[PDB]
Write a protein that binds this ligand. Structure first.
Ligand code: MG
Lengths: 50, 455, 586, 452, 393
């Protein structure tokens, strides 16, 4: 019974805490990355104009 | 002869362009005589042909181009320095703000100053007891060091800065610190906290204050720290004082630079910040230390708030690349009730080796520091590994490290903003916490010290 | 002759007209102050000049005069134990002359002491045919380093008149009969810092340098003539590593370039180094060192100068047959200096603002390092080992400077914030770090020690890798289900980390580790693992092994603090390990 | 000759009042001191013409310097005497050997082969490397690249292929065309020495461009090499194997020259026309109907940050038929060559395998070994997440399999040359660990014959 | 029409003056060499031209000839059982004429044979007033497909003279008395590939196409005029699936389109398809197939115009009343050509580097497919079914 609860804890700790952390930490990074790519390209267009 | 032109070509934001102009030098101080007779000081940013670009400190609100004139003073932005500045309070340009007597300048100084010859430098190694254990032991501040505080909005960095100023002293000496305080775009309450604190300790009579508040023109913030540092270097090297400089908020300074930068339509670096942010910041922070043959010294403690609490932001990242370490405050420790909220792990002092040890603090300073650091990192690791997997999930020796980490934060780091620990107390306290760890785990301390100090 | 007139001043960038008879990369006197500059662009008669000094107070209308020569260094006796600035000005002489503790403007200073009398020793004989690189004699500049006077590039003829005696670097010590006429030769020769000093042939650097840094010498070694980069965030410890290598390496000379960094660090070197004495040598550490300092708040354009004046000086001593180490701290500031100028000229930038030719520049620099056969009859061996610091924003090595650098360097010492904040020093990421010299150094080590060293390093790295592959699972499932074999692996890898990798630079014994002390320490650690591996195979439990090896594992932990004359106190551990382990099987 | 130079902006120069000047035209610059410096037209206008000097612009007085327009672009002098020679990026001698008198001069951009003129890759190429020959077969006329990283031993790999590559039978044997693109001298010297020490030089042509060489020379290097390759293959009927490295350095030279023309970059700071550019290079390979010889490309690139999503490995995988991938994880564990077969792919392997080319059990054992290796890694991971006890007796075998697969099959050494017989019989010895039950992806027509 | 004069060459960009008589999106022949180009911009008489072939050797002074038309296709007899590139360059004709194995720079060869004699069979008669669409006659182009000669768009009136006989695609087969006057019709018509061929009415695709593939016809059906996306991972068997669709679907014509595919992959397609057999007759599928073939190294314009050239041809035979199947592989590589053109035109990037008008372009292509009522008095009914393969990174 104790082994089940220890295992249950880790299943829950991973399913509710660890994975969702990863899931949109990823989502955050990918959108921050695309945010900057689009920022840099807008910079270079102005620099070409000047 | 007064050099003045009535030929302003264009006015855009803080920038002004003057045409049909002669004999004007780069970085020359200028005065705009607006049509209403109001005077607004400025500075030549760029000179080409018969044209001059100038930045107006007070801004260009309500300016008529035809009926305004620009005076060129034939010298860079200077500060009238005097020992009479002690106990006085000035605004962002060094002009009196406390409604007192007129300062009679001993001499005038280019607020840009001059780079100290690296051979002329005297290596700063005099231990400053701040009273804060997280600093004095683990991130030791020495006299002449640039050691900033990395904070965030809503964090108690003003409390830390004031405590350091109240308790800073070297050992075996009756010396004190002449305090040069620079306020950069900070609010009234942020400013009055320091004002009231300096009065309740009488430090106000050992201090010089340059105040640029949140309602002051943003461009003034560029001159402001150079004013303070020029006052500091003067008092230190020409008046033999040990000067403690405190500048906040350094973030506001950087964002002022970017304003001008953006206004000039300069080629933007990261987040609009110019490509010369590192160089520009360095010309402020490298203005500190000791000089061979001279009795004075400049100790810089800049304060910046990390935007979005991210120290990979240009402002804290570049600062960290310049200053000799940093004192980082985390929001997590602040909520925990830690005073001061110093996270020793990402904190650093690059001048702690030659400042501590036998004759400076104690023979066991370096050893216990490295051992507390190692145990705290391991203990904090275990703490987070127990909050997510339970107390029963962790090794028996690691729970000890977890009990250590908690006790280290609540009893060693957390000491209060009005507590002045002697280095001897701090070190003895450190050994107290090492005693709760097995002797076999203290692998960074040699058996010389363990037999002598470990209870 | 021709005098140009300033038409624009903005920061370090000055544009002047009437400069048509001037040339690209020419040095210039700018303004009434006469500050030092360089022509970088030229449109018609209008020259673009970057100023290696402050430009505050300089406006249009002021004169500009071209020296007609590119940025050069004076190469002769009086260079060792000297600290120069970016454009090679003696900073102590600067201090004396200007009578100030600060750096002024428009100050022209000869690099070397031109009035100091040295003793020249004529070793060559008159009537000998000479060409570039031939040694005509020497000066004992220091007790250990012998400064050799070589025939300058472009000079070829017969030695007609030469003698020993006491001369300054201006007195013609030698004369040469050439086809263009008689040539007088001094002890000093000028050289353009942006042009590599020519060699006979470049060689493959196969001899490993002894840095005494356990992680470097063992896992990521650099050879004499090799190239290494040390990229890391602030507080990672790039400078401390470069100092360790500067002070403990087995090279003849060390050229340290402070490029755009802290002034106090340079100040640390001029004071610490003269008191660091090598007992075998007997002489000071400053007497094999040259310092080039252009601090962060010094003129920006002088950062590139510091880099090039440093490497050129190194090439000069390399040409004598010396093994030279050149430290660049930091190369990022040089790159940031270009990016700064790149924007001021409003060019089209590359990635992250740097110029698109950033990679080409770095390539030009590192390719000037290397083990070579220097020019001359003697065909001497010389080497330049480049150790560069890189300072990426937020430790993000994805940036162009680190990326361009890794394309040309062979050794990558990746510093990590996590290690640094764990007091794991040197904070070298042993999973990201590499050395393209590992295989060759491994062969060398195997021969010198007559031990299977390559196997140990590979096994050491294999274990450290297996720990990484184990940690990435433990981080999110926990410690509970790890079999005895994997926990033993973690304990061995922990020993490699804490007892071998971590090394205190400020300790007296731990600051340097000999090649034979490194072998013994690593042998002991792996021996414990292997002997405890066999025990596990004989029914023994993991925790029984740890319980009974508390004493012998401590000797392993404090093995790093064992003095260099008592290495027997490490070899004996191998016997105790095997002895204690089998007793546990009872 | 024009003594009309207007501007010098960095290594870029502006030549005025010219005429009849063409794009990418070679030029000659005589400076005031008599020094000769060569360059190339990057931009050409009405009465202006912009050039880049290869050797830089230091010490140039423009008022007193002249410019000659050679009236031709970068060309390559070709002959059958190229075999056994070592050149630089421009195709000029680098070996101090007897200089060559060319048969003719060709443009280095080649031609687009008519879709209905191409011939299928047919012949199996024995690289001698098991991870490639068996699991990711290289076929004559393919473009099979090597995806590596900084500090990864692609150097030793590339040298090994060039050294061991051979076709079975077909007495007429290989012309290796090795191109070095913007690499250090120390690495180029490795390649040149390795070719001499083994004798591979005598069947090889080398184009060696260094890191501190001009960017323009880096760009021409793979174009020159392939031009010589096509000459040897389509005019001389040789079967040609082209190894190029480092491709990452090629793109960087492209960016440098792209910024000079003030072109706004595309994805991740690379030119918008990078695809076309890489396509123009990598497509210059394969057989042609009515012609004897062939061109086989092995482009080698270093993925920045070890990132497969990066433009350079991303766009290359689009054009090439698969990829060989080197991982740091395998390198750190002593596995050499560190080839990770799981993300590795050869899109034409099904053409160079089977009886008459290799044995009949090639495609069969490849699939099984690939499967068992994936089941092996899953098993090894299981024993850590759940532990020793959760392992089946079939799981412990699969774990032991992958361990032996890495350390005995993949890890052969950069100087071990394995015949495909030795490789295939090795792959069977490893399958012998598994019970006959598990090998379900092979026929037992094949199984009873070769299973140990 | 006026001949241009190059005044600047920079990379793939060419600027030329004296283009005042030209138009935007006009296909051009740049330089003496006459490489493939296109008019993107025009200030005054100065045109900004994107050259889709190497501009090496090109310089100021050389002429620029505009084709007086946007990128178009020749439609008529001689088009079936043929293989073209993206811009409809006859690959077989290249082999014969140029006598090489290469698509030479500046080589321009007409898409169809303009000298081949076909037998024209007149089905209509004098004094019949005809509107755009109406079939005036037919020609048996292959042994399977009957090519129906239609009256081009923008032409209406009475037929004043028409007779059967052996003609080429340039000889006058029919004379129509229009409002403008007397206009003579040929057996060929031209049409820009990025303008959809007009219809009378678009209809719902409510009739399922019979593929014979059980998993498709039963669980995931596609209608005549519908569209389907097909991922193509390696070793999945997309080629087998595609072949099965092409020869078993009850469609009259198949239009295969290759977009910037790998050279060796493209060779498989260009060879294994003439090997395919029409089950109803027993001849090659090519008898009712038009193949577009583009390799990666081919001009970006050809890669990008591939699916547009293909479906314009599809629309053409659709108007005859035939059921056409347009098959594109790979559209993800087609998008690459568009992404490439986005960065080269220095536009503002959309998601993952694709232009912000990617969605539009994709919508434009797929909306041209579908069941329609073809123009004409007969109100015929035809359809275009789209099977496009997506092979994403
Ligand atoms: Mg540093």
């Amino acid at each position: 019974a104790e082994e089940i609860e220890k295992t249950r804890r880790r299943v829950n700790a991973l399913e509710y805490m660890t994975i969702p952390q990863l899931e949109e930490t990823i989502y955050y990074i990918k959108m921050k990355l695309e945010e900057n790519e689009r920022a840099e390209v807008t910079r270079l267009i102005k620099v070409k104009n000047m | 002869m007064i050099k003045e032109y009535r030929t302003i070509k264009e006015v855009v934001g803080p920038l002004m362009a003057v045409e049909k102009v002669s004999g004007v030098k780069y970085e020359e101080l200028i005065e705009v005589r607006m049509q209403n007779g109001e005077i607004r000081r400025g500075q030549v940013l760029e000179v080409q042909e018969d044209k001059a670009m100038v930045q107006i400190f007070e801004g260009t609100s309500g300016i008529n181009l035809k009926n305004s004139s620009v005076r060129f003073l034939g010298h860079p932005l200077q500060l009238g320095v005097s020992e009479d500045m002690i106990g006085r309070v000035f605004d962002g340009l060094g002009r009196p703000k406390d409604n007192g007597p007129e300062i009679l300048p001993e001499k005038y100084l280019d607020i840009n100053g001059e780079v100290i010859n690296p051979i002329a430098r005297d290596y700063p190694d005099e231990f400053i007891q701040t009273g804060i254990s997280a600093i004095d032991h683990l991130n030791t501040l020495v006299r002449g060091q640039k050691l900033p505080v990395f904070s965030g909005s809503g964090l108690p960095h003003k409390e830390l800065a004031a405590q350091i100023a109240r308790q800073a002293t070297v050992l075996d000496s009756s010396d004190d610190f002449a305090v040069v305080f620079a306020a950069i775009g900070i609010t009234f309450e942020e400013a009055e906290f320091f004002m009231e604190d300096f009065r309740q300790t009488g430090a106000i009579d050992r201090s010089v204050m340059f105040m640029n508040l949140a309602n002051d023109p943003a461009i003034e913030r560029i001159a402001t720290p150079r004013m303070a540092l020029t006052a500091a270097e003067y008092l230190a090297y020409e008046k033999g004082m040990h000067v403690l400089v405190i500048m906040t908020d350094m973030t506001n300074y950087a964002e002022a630079l970017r304003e001008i930068s953006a206004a000039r339509r300069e080629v933007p670096g990261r987040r609009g910040y110019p490509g010369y942010l590192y160089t520009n910041l360095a010309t402020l922070f490298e203005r500190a230390g000791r000089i061979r043959g001279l009795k004075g010294s400049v100790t810089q403690i800049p304060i910046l708030t990390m935007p979005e609490d991210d120290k990979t932001h240009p402002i804290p990242d570049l600062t960290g690349y310049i200053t000799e370490g940093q004192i980082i405050l985390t929001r997590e420790l602040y909520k925990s009730g830690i005073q001061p909220p110093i996270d020793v792990l990402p904190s650093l002092s690059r001048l702690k080796d030659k400042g501590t040890g036998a004759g400076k603090t104690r023979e066991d300073h370096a050893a216990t520091m490295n051992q507390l650091f190692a145990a705290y990192a391991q203990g904090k690791q275990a703490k987070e590994l127990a909050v997510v997997l339970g107390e029963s999930a962790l090794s028996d020796i690691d729970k000890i490290y977890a009990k250590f980490a908690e006790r280290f934060e609540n009893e060693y780091v957390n000491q209060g903003f009005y507590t002045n620990r002697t280095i001897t107390e701090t070190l003895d306290l450190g050994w107290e916490l090492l005693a709760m760890l097995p002797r076999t785990e203290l692998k960074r301390i040699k058996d010389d010290l363990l037999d002598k100090y470990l209870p | 002759m021709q005098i140009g007139k300033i038409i624009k001043v903005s920061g370090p960038l000055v544009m002047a007209e009437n400069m048509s008879e001037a040339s690209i990369q020419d040095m210039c006197l700018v303004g009434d102050l006469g500050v030092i500059g360089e022509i970088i662009e030229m449109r018609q008669d209008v020259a673009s000049i970057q100023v290696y000094e402050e430009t505050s107070g300089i406006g249009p209308g002021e004169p500009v005069r071209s020296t007609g020569e590119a940025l050069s260094v004076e190469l002769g006796p009086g260079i060792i134990s000297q600290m120069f600035d970016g454009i090679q000005r003696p900073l102590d002489t600067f201090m004396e002359v200007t009578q100030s503790n600060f750096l002024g403007r428009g100050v022209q200073l000869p690099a070397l002491d031109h009035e100091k009398q040295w003793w020249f020793e004529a070793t060559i004989e008159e009537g000998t045919e000479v060409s570039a690189g031939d040694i005509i004699g020497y000066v004992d500049e220091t007790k250990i380093i012998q400064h050799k006077i070589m025939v300058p590039n472009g000079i070829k003829g017969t030695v007609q008149k030469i003698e020993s005696g006491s001369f300054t670097i201006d007195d013609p010590i030698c004369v040469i009969e050439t086809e263009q006429g008689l040539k007088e030769l001094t002890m000093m020769q000028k050289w353009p810092v942006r042009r590599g000093r020519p060699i006979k042939q470049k060689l493959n650097p196969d001899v490993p340098m002894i840095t005494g840094q356990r992680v470097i010498d063992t896992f990521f070694p650099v050879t004499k003539g090799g190239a290494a980069a040390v990229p890391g965030p602030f507080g990672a410890g790039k400078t401390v590593v470069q100092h360790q290598i500067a002070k403990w390496s087995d090279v003849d000379l060390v050229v340290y370039v402070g490029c755009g960094e802290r002034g106090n660090e340079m100040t640390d070197v001029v004071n610490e180094f003269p008191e660091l004495i090598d007992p075998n040598t007997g002489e000071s550490l400053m007497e094999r060192t040259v310092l080039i300092a252009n601090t962060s708040n010094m003129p920006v354009a002088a950062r590139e100068a510091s880099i090039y004046t440093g490497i050129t000086i190194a090439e000069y001593f390399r040409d004598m047959g010396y093994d030279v180490a050149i430290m660049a701290d930091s190369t990022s500031r040089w790159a940031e200096a270009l990016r700064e100028m790149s924007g001021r000229l409003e060019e089209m930038p590359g990635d992250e603002g740097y110029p698109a030719y950033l990679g080409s520049r770095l390539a030009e620099y590192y390719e000037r390092s290397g083990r070579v056969i220097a020019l001359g009859s003697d065909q001497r061996e010389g080497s330049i080992t480049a150790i560069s610091a890189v300072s990426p924003s937020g430790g993000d090595i994805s940036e162009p400077v680190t990326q361009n650098t890794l394309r040309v360097v062979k050794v990558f010492w990746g510093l990590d914030s996590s290690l640094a904040q764990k007091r794991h020093f040197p904070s070298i990421n042993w999973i990201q770090s590499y050395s393209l010299y590992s295989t060759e150094v491994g062969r060398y080590m195997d021969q010198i020690l007559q031990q299977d060293w390559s196997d140990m390093v590979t096994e050491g790295m294999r274990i450290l890798q297996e720990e990484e592959q184990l940690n990435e699972i433990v981080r999110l499932v926990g410690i509970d289900s790890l079999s005895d074999n994997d926990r033993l692996t973690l304990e061995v890898a922990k020993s490699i980390r804490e007892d071998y990798l971590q090394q205190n630079a400020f300790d007296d014994v731990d600051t340097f580790t000999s090649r034979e002390k490194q072998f013994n320490m690593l042998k002991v650690i792996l021996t414990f693992g292997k002997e405890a591996r066999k025990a596990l195979s004989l029914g023994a439990y993991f925790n029984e092994i740890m319980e009974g090896t508390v004493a012998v594992r401590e000797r392993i932990s404090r093995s790093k603090y064992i003095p260099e004359e008592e290495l027997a106190k490490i070899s004996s551990i191998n016997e105790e390990i095997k002895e204690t382990i089998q007793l546990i099987v009872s």
